[PDB]
């Protein structure tokens, strides 16, 4: 229950050990199936002596899926060529994962594949996957099939349709951990006419939903020249590339108030910092924060620019240099896989 895990480099959930599953209505795996919707459930328990905190999920489907965690709809998606990234807070000892899969083309294959990378309170992680231990039904999902109160003890086992490397679908591409589409390159307002002075600049963003309980954050960040990233005053990481982005996991968020602070440095010419942050809440919801004009910025970095509760007098609104994609940096940022 005590969280000794600390901020770390983001660890990708992989699909390599995962299996495609369906109902087995057609006993040929990868065989033709009817248009239909089918349920899939798995109760996963935390190993002895650890608490589960949150999970990075990658899910792929032929043809479409709706993903639930402990009764809460977490995401909807479709397609088997590229997986979908989802993030969710978890109960400490067990968690019910439920998926409604849909086959949308008659006489065509059908399948659900997911990988669930659970992070534990002690800083360790374990991947769980769709396989034959999941429960299903040869029928449309009952009402409230995804709720933990539904009893699945008399459900049949899911039928494996294929493996990551051996299936009709081939191996799905991992999505990026988080999008940079939707974020902006920002800087202090001394950034004009495509260049900014040499020097360091600081940026701050606070999230404070005092009626919710925040659990984990995933951060994706890049800066033209370099950055150091802080959360609630603690150093998270640093980078020096505007073509290869860095991803971090913050597993020990404060429950209600969290401040992200950045020291970014321009070595000459253009400058900018860009980031996308996803925070998970204990009720299963999430929120995304992006670098934009709601961040604060300052041109001379004061002592203790990174502590959570400083006086922000004399900080300006950060300037939007451009949405992700603009010249000179373009759209080709290398982003870690989800």
Ligand X SMILES: *[C@@H]1O[C@H](CO)[C@@H](O[C@@H]2O[C@H](CO)[C@@H](O)[C@H](O)[C@H]2NC(C)=O)[C@H](O)[C@H]1NC(C)=O
**C-alpha separations of 102 from 60, 121, 164, 320 in Å:** 12, 35, 20, 41
Backbone angles phi, psi at 23, to 5 degrees: -95, -20
Whole-angstrom distance, CA of residue 100 vs CA of residue 262? 41
Residues 223-262 as x/- pattern, contact with ligand X by CB under 6 A: ---x-x----------------------------------
Q: How many residues in the shown chain lie near Ca ion by CB under 5 A?
A: 10
Q: Which listed option, Ca ion, ligand X, ligand RAM, none, makes contact with residue 190 (CB within 5 to 8 Å by class)?
A: none
Vertex 9 angle, CA 335 and 206, to 5° = 85
**C-alpha separations of 302 from 211, 297, 299 in Å:** 32, 11, 9
> Is residue 200 at the binding interface for ligand X, with CB under 6 A as the rule?
yes
Stretch that binds ligand X, among 24-32, 87-95, 99-107, 128-136 (CB under 6 A): 87-95
> Is residue 154 at the binding interface for ligand X, with CB under 6 A as the rule?
no
On whether 63 is known to bind a ligand per the annotation, the reply is yes
In this chain, which of 268, 314, 325, 330 binds ligand RAM, going by CB under 6 A?
A: 268
DSSP β-ladder status, 19-22 and 214-223? unpaired
**C-alpha separations of 116 from 42, 78, 80, 107, 270 in Å:** 11, 17, 17, 30, 40
Q: Which listed option, Ca ion, ligand X, ligand RAM, none, makes contact with residue 86 (CB within 5 to 8 Å by class)?
A: ligand X
Backbone angles phi, psi at 206, to 5 degrees: -110, 135
DSSP β-ladder status, 111-120 and 226-231? unpaired
Residues 219-238 as x/- pattern, contact with Ca ion by CB under 5 A: -----xx-------------
> Is residue 96 at the binding interface for ligand X, with CB under 6 A as the rule?
yes
On whether 52 is known to bind a ligand per the annotation, the reply is no
Residues 59-98 binding ligand RAM (CB under 6 A) are 62-63
**What letter would DSSP give residue 33?**
B
Whole-angstrom distance, CA of residue 184 vs CA of residue 290? 7
Q: How many residues in the shown chain lie near ligand X by CB under 6 A?
A: 20
- Binding-site residues for Ca(2+), in ranges, read 62-63, 103, 108-109, 224-225, 266, 268, 270
Binding residues vs ligand RAM (CB under 6 A): 62-63, 104-105, 108-109, 224-225, 267-270, 328
List interacting residues with Ca ion (CB under 5 A).
Answer: 62-63, 103, 105, 108, 224-225, 266, 269, 271
* Residue positions forming the annotated binding site for N-acetyl-D-galactosamine: 268
């Amino acid at each position: 229950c005590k969280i000794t895990a600390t901020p770390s480099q983001f660890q990708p959930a992989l699909l390599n050990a995962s299996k495609w599953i369906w109902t087995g209505e057609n006993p040929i795996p990868g065989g033709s199936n009817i248009i239909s919707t089918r349920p899939f459930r798995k109760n996963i328990t935390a190993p002895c002596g650890k608490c589960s905190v949150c999970a990075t999920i990658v899910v792929a489907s032929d043809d479409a899926h709706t993903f639930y965690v402990n009764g809460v709809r977490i995401g909807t998606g479709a397609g088997f060529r590229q997986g979908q990234a989802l993030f969710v807070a978890l109960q400490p000892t067990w968690n019910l994962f439920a998926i409604a899969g849909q086959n949308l083309v008659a006489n065509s294959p059908a399948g659900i594949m997911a990988s669930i990378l659970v992070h534990f309170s002690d800083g360790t992680s374990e991947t769980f996957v769709t396989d034959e231990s999941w429960k299903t039904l040869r029928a449309a999902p009952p009402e409230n099939f995804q709720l933990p109160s539904t009893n699945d003890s008399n459900w049949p086992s899911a039928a494996v349709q294929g493996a990551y490397q051996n299936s009709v679908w081939g191996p799905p591409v991992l999505p990026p951990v988080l999008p940079l589409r939707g974020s902006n390159w920002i800087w202090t307002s001394d950034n004009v006419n495509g260049a900014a002075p040499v020097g360091s600049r600081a940026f701050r963003k606070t999230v404070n939903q005092c009626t919710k309980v925040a659990v984990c954050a995933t951060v994706l960040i890049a800066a033209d020249d370099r950055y150091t990233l802080y959360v609630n005053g603690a150093t998270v990481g640093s980078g020096s590339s505007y073509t290869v982005a860095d991803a971090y996991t913050i597993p020990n968020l404060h429950p209600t108030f969290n401040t992200f602070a950045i020291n970014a440095t321009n070595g000459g010419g253009p400058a900018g910092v860009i980031a996308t942050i996803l925070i998970t809440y204990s009720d299963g919801s999430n929120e995304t924060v992006v670098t934009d004009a709601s961040w604060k910025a300052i041109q001379t970095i004061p002592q203790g620019f990174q502590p959570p509760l400083i006086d922000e007098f004399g900080w300006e609104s950060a300037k939007i240099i451009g949405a992700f994609g603009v010249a000179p940096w373009g759209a080709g940022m290398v982003i870690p896989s989800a």
